[PDB]
Design a protein around this ligand. Structure first.
Ligand SMILES: Nc1ccn([C@H]2C[C@H](O)[C@@H](CO)O2)c(=O)n1
Ligand SMILES: *[C@@H]1O[C@H](CO)[C@@H](O)[C@H](O)[C@H]1NC(C)=O
Ligand SMILES: [Zn+2]
Ligand SMILES: [Zn+2]
Ligand SMILES: [Zn+2]
Length: 267
C-alpha cells in the first residue's frame, strides 16, 4: 500500500489490540502517542532505499509464480527467493519480538511487522507478473500510471478522501465499525482462523494466499486488453473498492491479533 493504506491498517490494529499490547508496543517504539502504530507504519518503505536498508527491499512482497487471472496460487519455497520475502521477514521479525523484545533489534522488527502485514494484504504484493503489476501501464483519471500504483495509492486515497494521518485515522475508524457492528461483523471471527504464533510461515501464508485469490477474481479478471485501454477510475474502481476495503480491514484485524500474540510472550 501507499502511506495512507499502511497508516489505516495500523490505526485499525490500534483499535483492536489489548491495552497490555498497546503498552508493549509503545515501549518498544519509544512512542507513547495516540498514533504509535500509524507513525511507524511507513518507515520500511523509505528505509529500503537507504544504504543501510537496501537488504530489506525484497521483504515487501512474495512474487507468486502463478498464471492469473485463470490460475492463482502462492507457494513459499517456490516464490520467496534466496534474498527473502514478505513471508520470511514475518517469520524473522516476529521471532525477534518473541525472543528479544528488549533487545536492539526489537524496534525495527516491530516496524517491519506493522508494515509487512499490511503489504501482504495488497493482492499485487503476492504476484510475480510484471513486477507485481509495476510493469502494467494504465490510465487512471486521465493520467498515465501503473496497475501496482493504483492498488497501492490511487484507489485507496480516492476512497479515503485524501492521504494525511488524520484521513487515515478517519478511514480506519470507518472500517473498524464495519468490523465491530457492520458488514464484516459476521465474517471477522473467521479472519483469525488458523493463526499460530509458533508458525509464522504458515500463518502469514494463509494471509498471502487470501490476498492472492483477488489477483484472479478482481485485479486481473477483466483481462489485460481491458486494463491496457480503459480508464480505471470508473467501473474498475467501483468493483475494486469493496475488495481493497475488506483486505485493509483484514490486514488491521489480523495485525492486531498477531501483536496480541507477540505481546503475550508465550513459553
Ligand atoms: N515484484 C515486485 C516489485 C515491487 N513491488 C512493490 C515494492 C516497490 O516499492 C513498489 C514499486 O516498485 O512495488 C512488488 O510488490 N512486487
Ligand atoms: C533478520 O533481521 C535482521 C535485522 O534486520 C537482518 O539483519 C537479517 O537480514 C534477517 N534475517 C533473515 C533470516 O532474514
Ligand atoms: Zn505498501
Ligand atoms: Zn506496493
Ligand atoms: Zn512496503
Amino acid at each position: 500500500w501507499g502511506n495512507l493504506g499502511h497508516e489505516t491498517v495500523a490505526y485499525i490494529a490500534q483499535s483492536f489490540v489489548a491495552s497490555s499490547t498497546e503498552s508493549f508496543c509503545q515501549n518498544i517504539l519509544g512512542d507513547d502517542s495516540t498514533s504509535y502504530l500509524a507513525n511507524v507504519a511507513t518507515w520500511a518503505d523509505t528505509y529500503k532505499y537507504t544504504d543501510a536498508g537496501e537488504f530489506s527491499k525484497p521483504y515487501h512482497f512474495i512474487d507468486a509464480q502463478d498464471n492469473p487471472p485463470q490460475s492463482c496460487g502462492v507457494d513459499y519455497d517456490r516464490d520467496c527467493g534466496s534474498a527473502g520475502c514478505s513471508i520470511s521477514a514475518i517469520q524473522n521479525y516476529t521471532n525477534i519480538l518473541l525472543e528479544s523484545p528488549n533487545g536492539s533489534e526489537a524496534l525495527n522488527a516491530l516496524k517491519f511487522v506493522v508494515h509487512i502485514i499490511g503489504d501482504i494484504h495488497q493482492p499485487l504484493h503476492d504476484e510475480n507478473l510484471e513486477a507485481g503489476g509495476n510493469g502494467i501501464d494504465v490510465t487512471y483519471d486521465g493520467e498515465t500510471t501503473n496497475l501496482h500504483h493504483i492498488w497501492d495509492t490511487n484507489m485507496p486515497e480516492e476512497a479515503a478522501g485524501g492521504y494525511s494521518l488524520s484521513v487515515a485515522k478517519t478511514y480506519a475508524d470507518l472500517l473498524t465499525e464495519r468490523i465491530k457492528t457492520g458488514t464484516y461483523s459476521s465474517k471477522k471471527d473467521s479472519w483469525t482462523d488458523g493463526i499460530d504464533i509458533k508458525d509464522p510461515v504458515s500463518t502469514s501464508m494463509i494471509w498471502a494466499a487470501d490476498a492472492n485469490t483477488y489477483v484472479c477474481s478482481t485485479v486481473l479478471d477483466d483481462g489485460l486488453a481491458y486494463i491496457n485501454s480503459t480508464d480505471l477510475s470508473g467501473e474498475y474502481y467501483d468493483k475494486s473498492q469493496p475488495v481493497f476495503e475488506e483486505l485493509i480491514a483484514k490486514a488491521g484485524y489480523r495485525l492486531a491479533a498477531w501483536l496480541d500474540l507477540i505481546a503475550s510472550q508465550p513459553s
